[PDB]
Amino acid sequence: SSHKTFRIKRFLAKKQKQNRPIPQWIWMKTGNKIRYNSKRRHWRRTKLGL
Amino acid sequence: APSRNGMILKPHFHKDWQRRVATWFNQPARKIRRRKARQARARRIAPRPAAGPIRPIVRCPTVRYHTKVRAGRGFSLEELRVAGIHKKVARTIGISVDPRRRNKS
């Protein structure tokens, strides 16, 4: 909704910040096993709770 | 269900006995610890007898054992005052004392 609280807006801001693909320069580290970000979140599919 | 000639038994295993099962796997460790503490105390009390104070002659109470002597708790106050030693000096010089013991003979 357009009517938000400061706390809920801040929480949504953090989740939006962390919804991001990985940078490719980490893929070239020595002991790196990560291939993609497996904690992605599409708005339509996963509804984030709340 | 009993079967043929046997001896009917009463096992006391109807409580939650598996919750309380005290194993003895630390028995050798306990023996080592006891012996080490014994040596530590003996070396701490440098010249004194390693087995603590002296203790008196005691007859065992009941008819089943009243033909045997053993070591008791401490010497009695009548014995101290007949020997000439003081109540509060006996413990300092290393003699076990108890004020509970009577002397019937």
């Binding site: 807006k9 801040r10 949504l12 801001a13 953090k14 939006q16 910040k17 | -």
Partner: protein, 118 residues
């Protein structure tokens, strides 16, 4: 003295004022929200450039604990300019954008030139 009201009220007694034999805290805390820590960086997007060229405003991103008075004083201190009015909003990212309009006799192009954004 005689009583004229049938109620009994607690009499007002002398309330002495605190004098601490030692301060609770060793020293007063340092103001961590100062002029440098209140302003982070100015926006350099096409919207920001259009605003600075047209409305004579300056676009800054400040922290969430700043209010318009502190923002105005901090801009005055850091850049030695006069401030007319301040608009503020909190972006969906979490940073708090600031629209700072200047007095008509200052030039936003010159202020941007001196600050380093262009």
């Amino acid at each position: 003295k005689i009583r004229t009201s049938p109620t009994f009220r607690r009499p007002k007694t002398l309330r002495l004022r605190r004098q601490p034999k030692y301060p609770r805290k060793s020293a007063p805390r340092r103001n961590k929200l100062d002029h440098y820590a209140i302003i982070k960086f100015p926006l350099t997007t096409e919207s920001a450039m259009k605003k600075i060229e047209d409305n004579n405003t300056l676009v800054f991103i400040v922290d969430v604990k700043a209010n318009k008075h502190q923002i105005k004083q901090a801009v005055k201190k850091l850049y030695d300019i006069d401030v007319a009015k301040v608009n503020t909003l909190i972006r969906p990212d979490g940073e708090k954008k600031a629209y700072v309009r200047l007095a008509p006799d200052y030039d936003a192009l010159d202020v941007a030139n001196k600050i380093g954004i262009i």
